[model samples]
Target chain A: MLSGLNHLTLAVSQLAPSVAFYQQLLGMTLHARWDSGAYLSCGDLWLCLSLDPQRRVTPPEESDYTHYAFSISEADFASFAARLEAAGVAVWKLNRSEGASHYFLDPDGHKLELHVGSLAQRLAACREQPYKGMVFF
Target chain B: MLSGLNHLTLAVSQLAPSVAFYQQLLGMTLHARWDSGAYLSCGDLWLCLSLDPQRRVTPPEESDYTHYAFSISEADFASFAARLEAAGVAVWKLNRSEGASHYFLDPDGHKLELHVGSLAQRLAACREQPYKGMVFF
Candidate 1:
């Protein structure tokens, strides 16, 4: 049986710039680096950026909802947006749910969202405005 | 500043099978489900499986190291292998790193790994056997 999410590894087209993107722009602390990879930490999450010269990045628009979301406070939402702007990061999608979600793309085109809420809160929202055929287990 | 990984939303090709895979096989607890989505909790991780009929499934071998890893106990590693065999899950890649790793593909072709160690242990391992140009902070 699985316990928890141990880490995430993202394929990067380059190493140094990807390190800068995660460390400088997204505020993940750089923990370690090698010629082909680097490790960064976001609170308890261990993120790995692996260099791949042959990495592919072509997302079909119809099913492009896959993403990794980082939790932020409502107070920090605007400031995160500001940091995204400063880095010239592309906003891939706007908020569509109960939270203040800012979906953006990383240097390697990985979709990332800065969500201002939690699962419990979202479930509570669903209790108020539940989707069709929704069921809680 | 970012706090941590709040959740992960994956565009899945189907809902029920994805639910069964995560809930039944992966040991995640189902918290909610709708027509097109379901939320499953793995310890502190929130995993969202959003049904997308048009979801894409193509992987280039050159850069397919991108993956999500779940932490397990060293004692449970072999048991996990048995569970994988019982579920007919595909072992996408064999263990290539330290800490009893088993990389496999989910029903939706999502790359996942079962690891039996923590980041602290991995960092400590690196201290003894560092890669070329590796630096730690």
Candidate 2:
């Protein structure tokens, strides 16, 4: 029986760039570290970026719906998206009546999202204006 | 700018089997579903399994070291391992002076961990024993 999520670890080609993106861009705090990986805290969530030198590192194609979505408040959404674009990260958008979301690929091509509302709120909004792009459930 | 984690979506080859593995074996709650994916909640964290029809899904190689770890109480650790083994899930152990962890591969090459502590606790424990794994600082 599972309780709750403790952390999610992503396989990355290089640890340095991945850590920089999360820490500098996303503003995640460094909780712990060793050699090929590090643990970061985003609100109550723990994210790990693991290094796998010999493995194939591929970013999701544009059509791929698989990605991790992080929460951001409505007031903070505008500045956050702008900061991402200013830092040279490509930003893709998904519109909803409740709130909007922006998607981008990480240094290792891992797809991530920054959404401006809770799941229930977003789903309710989607019911009125259905999401056009691909998403899980 | 981010408030917290909203959800993590992973790509899988089949929806039914992956849903069964997470719902039946892992004991997660099925919150909702669509044609290509399903959403399951582990406490407050949501996990999405996205079906990738044309993609080649492979399990993580032993050297990959990338995986998501779930939180488990120290009291529930033994029986959880037993239940997992009983269900024919392979368990791998990692020793830490503060506590130990078990690793297992999900149906779609995703590496998952069951740790008997929180991230704060693990980081504190590591301060005492020091984790020797590959991690970034």
Candidate 3:
């Protein structure tokens, strides 16, 4: 029987920059590769980068709060932050009573956060925050 | 340290229909709710559905193929299918060899599947007929 969540695929305008960005930030291993796309694995969930230049999904627009959080250790936040600074990727500074985290945008303008903690901690933080204000992927 | 996956937030245009559709098809509990949205638990994963009247974001045109899967019991499939049929939900035929399971979609057109067994079973299925085509939300 089909079991747990295996992977999540996102449609991107391009894959090269995204590949580099995610690989460096999340430390995800290259699970596989293909002509049109690539796959990344963090634990069990696979992240897919699809190259479909033929069909552009949306016109470029200003940034929205659209983003998803990746799981990382609370201890890793400082090192990750240092890496972001070194790469000149502006990590949006946000305050959460529980921990420290930062945000970065992908090549396609998708906002992504590298947070330290389990999914429960993140979801709880989201719940405690106001609507239209919480970080969502 | 970031623990396991806590939850994923899904923005929906309507709350009742979305909740009904998910609860009926996936058999998850509506564990929490707020004025602007509701939260459901799938196994240990908390799925929050936010109700945005303005939809703030543009509607997705393609299937989004955006999907997630959950493991159920081989013995419980009948009850699960029975509930959906009674609710008048269109049930997608279950694909057994791919790992015994059934599939369905939510009101917003998000694809989802329900299955039974362990991680070993899922690994076997992924090897036999890998479903590497799904899109992430």
- Summing lDDT over every window of 10 consecutive residues in candidate 2 chain A, give the lowest-scoring window: A128-137
lDDT of 1 at A111: 87
Q: Please write out the lDDT profile of model 1 over residues A11-112, one tens digit for every residue.
A: 888787889889987889998898889988999998988887766664525336788999899998998898898878888877879989888888778889
lDDT for model 3, please: 0.57
Q: Give the Å error, residue B54, model 2.
A: 4.0
**Alpha-carbon error at A129 in model 3, in Å?**
9.8
Best by lDDT: 1
Each candidate's DockQ: 0.78, 0.48, 0.19
Cα DockQ of the candidate 1 complex: 0.78
| Candidate with best TM-score | 1
From the highest TM-score down, the ranking of the candidates is 1, 2, 3
- Taking the tens digit of each residue's C-alpha lDDT, what string does model 2 give over B19-116? 89888888888766667777788888778788887445554444355567888888888888778888887544455423667777677667678877
- Arrange candidates by lDDT, highest first: which order? 1, 2, 3
lDDT tens digits by residue: candidate 1, B87-136: 78876776466467888887767888888888888889888988678899
Best by DockQ: 1
List TM-scores for all candidates, in order. Answer: 0.94, 0.84, 0.64
